[PDB]
Ligand SMILES: Nc1c(C(=O)NC[C@@H]2CCCO2)cc2c(=O)n3ccccc3nc2[n+]1Cc1ccco1
């Protein structure tokens with residue numbers, strides 16, 4: 001089993017996946033406890049008073065979603081609560097917090113009490129990102145780095161004596177890593193660092209690209225927008241391999257291409273792809289939306305024979321890049337080869353947990369688990 005293996009498999013749960021129609025609805029009891037060593041609940045948010053608070057009281061509290069996910073401790077899974085996320089990182093509120101020692105001190109004691117009230121095993125920090133707020137490095141002060149490092153120390157100093165876990169989800173981008181993270185401090189204090197080795201490319205690039213390349217590709221604009229560079233860079237900056245879990249996407253980035261006629265990488269794009277009927281977000285498709293388009297709507301799939309990145313698929317002016325089982329196995333062999341702490345997925349509710357595509361339930365996540373448990377590298 002994963003729990004008895006040397007690897008973690010950190011699974012993100014999202015409370016908002018409840019608000020999806022038909023088979024896209026996901027609830028706490030849809031979690032498969034054989035597929036995760038750790039579950040991280042996304043998300044709590046930073047309140048206006050500088051204290052962690054529930055994002056969705058109707059689900060988190062009134063419908064006991066926190067309790068229903070903390071339920072999985074009964075299987076030996078560690079269940080943490082994540083603070084932040086992309087949407088909660090839009091403004092200056094996390095920067096204001098971390099740059100204020102008195103505000104940090106108030107936040108830390110309340111946060112630990114919050115975790116203990118609901119039975120969580122730890123806190124996961126998901127500020128995206130210190131200094132580079134929503135990736136814009138011009139927005140925040142350099143002191144976000146020291147402030148975040150001190151927040152991590154102050155949290156660790158309270159959580160660790162209580163046997164509670166502290167982790168962070170972190171950027172894969174060299175410039176954001178350089179600007180936002182005191183890597184030795186984080187590496188020493190955090191129980192794991194979930195490197196978000198995805199969203200390297202998307203509609204914001206104005207051209208097609210892969211959500212999550214593993215290795216450099218000769219046509220890349222940079223040498224650093226791939227998981228191999230990112231993971232080695234976290235280690236070069238001072239992170240032990242055992243502290244790293246490598247993120248893998250259960251979704252794709254979608255694009256509306258300017259011209260039906262060319263359908264390859266790095267081709268001009270006019271907008272995000274049309275929203276999926278379940279996830280309802282321009283530029284984003286769950287794996288179970290992508291596999292259905294391939295299986296039943298005739299989308300054409302292009303694979304990389306050198307397996308530096310997963311496939312992309314297209315039809316008409318729609319184009320999506322994503323990870324299939326084949327590239328997932330390659331990525332997990334990469335995790336094992338570097339002796340990393342394990343793997344991480346964003347997110348449980350985006351894999352084909354209903355077996356809509358006939359590959360079996362949870363095809364991507366089961367591929368990760370099987371490869372992690374395979375002793376050969
Ligand atoms: N919203 C987002 C999101 C996102 O976290 N979740 C989407 C949700 C989540 C659940 C359901 O689908 C991530 C990124 C991102 O990693 N970026 C990286 C580098 C540069 C820009 C950028 N922008 C992002 N944006 C804005 C965006 C761009 C175009 C349209 O929106």
Ligand SMILES: *[C@@H]1O[C@H](CO)[C@@H](O)[C@H](O)[C@H]1NC(C)=O
Pocket residue numbers: 215216228229232
């Ligand atoms: C992965 O990265 C390392 C260090 O950056 C590099 O030496 C190696 O060649 C890369 N692997 C590739 C490009 O397949």
